[PDB]
Amino acid sequence: SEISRQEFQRRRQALVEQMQPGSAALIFAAPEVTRSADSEYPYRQNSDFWYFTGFNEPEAVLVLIKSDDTHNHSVLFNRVRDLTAEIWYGRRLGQDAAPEKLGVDRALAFSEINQQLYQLLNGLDVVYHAQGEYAYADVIVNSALEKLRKGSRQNLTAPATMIDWRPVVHEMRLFKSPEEIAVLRRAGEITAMAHTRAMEKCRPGMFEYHLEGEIHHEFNRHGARYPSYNTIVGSGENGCILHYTENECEMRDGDLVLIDAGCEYKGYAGDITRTFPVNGKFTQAQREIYDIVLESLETSLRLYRPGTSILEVTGEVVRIMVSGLVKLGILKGDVDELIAQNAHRPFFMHGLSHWLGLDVHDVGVYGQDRSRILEPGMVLTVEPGLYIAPDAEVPEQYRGIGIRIEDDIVITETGNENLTASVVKKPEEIEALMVAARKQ
Ligand SMILES: [Mn+2]
Ligand SMILES: [Mn+2]
Numbered sequence: 001s002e003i004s005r006q007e008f009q010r011r012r013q014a015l016v017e018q019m020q021p022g023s024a025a026l027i028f029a030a031p032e033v034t035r036s037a038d039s040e041y042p043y044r045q046n047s048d049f050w051y052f053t054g055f056n057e058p059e060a061v062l063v064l065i066k067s068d069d070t071h072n073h074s075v076l077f078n079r080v081r082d083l084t085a086e087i088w089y090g091r092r093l094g095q096d097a098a099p100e101k102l103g104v105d106r107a108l109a110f111s112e113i114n115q116q117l118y119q120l121l122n123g124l125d126v127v128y129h130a131q132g133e134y135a136y137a138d139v140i141v142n143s144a145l146e147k148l149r150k151g152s153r154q155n156l157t158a159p160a161t162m163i164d165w166r167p168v169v170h171e172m173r174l175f176k177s178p179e180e181i182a183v184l185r186r187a188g189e190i191t192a193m194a195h196t197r198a199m200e201k202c203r204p205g206m207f208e209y210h211l212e213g214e215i216h217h218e219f220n221r222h223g224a225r226y227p228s229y230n231t232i233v234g235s236g237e238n239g240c241i242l243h244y245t246e247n248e249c250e251m252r253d254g255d256l257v258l259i260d261a262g263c264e265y266k267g268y269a270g271d272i273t274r275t276f277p278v279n280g281k282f283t284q285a286q287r288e289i290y291d292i293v294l295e296s297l298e299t300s301l302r303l304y305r306p307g308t309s310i311l312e313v314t315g316e317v318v319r320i321m322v323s324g325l326v327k328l329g330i331l332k333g334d335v336d337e338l339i340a341q342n343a344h345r346p347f348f349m350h351g352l353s354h355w356l357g358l359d360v361h362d363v364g365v366y367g368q369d370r371s372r373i374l375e376p377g378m379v380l381t382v383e384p385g386l387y388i389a390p391d392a393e394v395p396e397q398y399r400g401i402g403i404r405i406e407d408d409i410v411i412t413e414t415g416n417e418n419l420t421a422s423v424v425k426k427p428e429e430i431e432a433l434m435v436a437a438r439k440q
Contacts, residue, residue, distance in 0.1 A: 001182040002266050003054055009103050011172070012052050012064060012074065018168055021068045023126035025165055026117075027052060028137040029060040042226060047358040048130070048169050050267050053102055057093065059110040061140075063120055075120060076104040077113050118144040122156050128165040166363075173357055174364030175377035181410055183268045184356070184379060187224070188408055188419030190263045191270030194218040195423040198261075199430065200437035204253035204278050208233040211259060212247050219263040228269035228360045232260035235278060239402025240387045242350060253279045256286055258402050262360060269360040271381040272420050273406030280434035282427050285397035289386050290427060292324035293403050296384030297425070300352065301407065304382065305415045310370035314352045317384055318344050325386075330394045347387060353380045356408055378411045 019025060030046035045056050053062055053076075061077040081094030098107035108116050121127055121144055129141050148158030176184065194215040201214045212231045219227060234244035236255035243260075251257055257278050262270040275293075277286060296317045303313045321344045325331035331343055338344075351370065355362035356379045366372055383406030390400040405425050409416040424430055 001179070001186050003179055003183070005103055007177065007179050008052055008054055010177075012103075014172060015052070015165070015169060016064055016066050016072045019064070019066045019072075019128065020126050021066060022124050023066050023128060023159065024121060024124055025062075025064040025128040026137070026141060027062045027064075027130075027165075028134055029055070029058055031134060031136055032058050044226075045267070046133075047267070047363075048166070048173075051169070051173060051358060054267075055093070055102055061110070061113065061117075061137075062104070063117075065120065065124075073105045075116075076102060076107045077110045077116070078107060080109040080111060113140060114143065117141075118147040118156070121145065121159060122148055124159045126161040126163055127159045128163050130164055130166050131162065133166075167365075170363035171365065173362065174355065175375070176357065176379050176410065177377075180268070180357075181379070183266050184270075184408070184410070185417075185419050186222075187263055187265040187268045187270035188272075189422055190219060190222045190224050190265055191261065191272045192420050192423035193222070194261060194263065195259060195272050195274045196433065198259055199274065199276055199424075199433055202251065202257065202276070202278060202280075202434070203438075204251060206251055208235055208238070208247035208249050208251055208257070211251075211257070212261075215259070215261045222263075222265075224263035224265040224270075226264045228262040228264040228271075232258065232273075234258045234260075234402060237390050237400040237402075239275065239404075240389055240400060241402070242387070251278045254283070256401065256403065258404055260404060260406065267358050269356060269358070269362075270420075271354075271356060271360055271383065271406050271408050272423065273383055273385075273404040274423060274425065274430075275403040275405060276430045276434070280431060280438060282431065286401065286403075287427060288328055289388065289398060289401050289403055290405075292321060293384050293386050293405050294425060294427075295324070296320050296352075297382060297405050297407065300382050300384065301409070301416070301418060304374065304380075304409060304411065306375050306411060306413070307373060309373055310351070310353045310366070310380070312371075314370070317352055318342075318348075321348055321384075321386065328395070328398070330388065330392075330398055346389075346392075348385060349387070350385070352384060353382055355379065356381055374411045376411050376413045380409060380411075382407045382409055 029049045035041045063075040066072040079092045095107040145158045148156045197218045198211040211233050230245045233247040235251045235257040238244045239258035258275040260273040355364045385404035387402045388398045407420045
């Protein structure tokens, strides 16, 4: 699945629609990033730029100009085609194929941007710019405006009003279209298949990074070349570290292993977290902590729908965590009192949900304490967890236990759709899965 050319145009129009007459929106592409010396990291396009263009190239600037309520055109600045640069690095689009390929009106050379941009801005009243996003962008836009302020003798005028378009654009990215939901849906299946794979390959003696390998390979097998974020494979005490990415330790029999890994498919992120026994059989202590986290997840999945909020559902989860923690001796006291004093924080110290989209931790306003009312189109993760420090003053059997069980969902008109439910989470199911795999 993917975003059709019709859709990028629709997005560009949706933004233009909100623009004031006599203005221009400048959206810059992401700079190339060094990994070491004359080596660069696999290029990743700025998410906002990509959202409107789907163009995976550096040194590109999309300009949307709006004259009035029905008159608007677009200018794209991108790299000039060049034969030496194309024999070495990859094929470029160039100004000639650009207008047709990217659905833009005019396509100029990036090398000409400083000679061209001020001409495009001259005479307008407003210019939408994400000031501070990129330093190279700030230099360009500022000198275009300084040329305009300084050239009144040449009859040039600079738009006195600058407006950040991020709030507007991010508010748009917050609500997914059916096309996007279809992409994310695939991102979910791919990530789910990867998680199922790790569970089936896991054996005591294997290193944590080995499961990172199996996960990344499965991503690749379905056309998702890169992970949306750095893979977490924390076994034993490592599972207590939220973003444990070193994955350097040998997975031992008896310990649990928490895998937090997601694929990047057509620019969209997949978040899945699954915790399971390295040996395929949960101990009673492990099962006791797991059940509380699983109930938090299952209940939240049941609760999430239009009308509620992340804050509201989180309350139901805190309640479940405290109740369960008291029953095991991890917490001591009256449930309602412990709740009121937020007694779960030393064990569950992060949010229950984040927006999900082009960025794992997607854009979009949450509202104070993430209280915003959920509406159809919003896509989020559902990820309860309990991390009992190795030196926590609680019954020994719970020390060094880290468990998270994260699903990705879409708020539908009546409830929500679970994009990552194709990878098992119930303990009997996880055990059955691992046992079936260990035959062969
Ligand atoms: Mn997440
Ligand atoms: Mn995650």
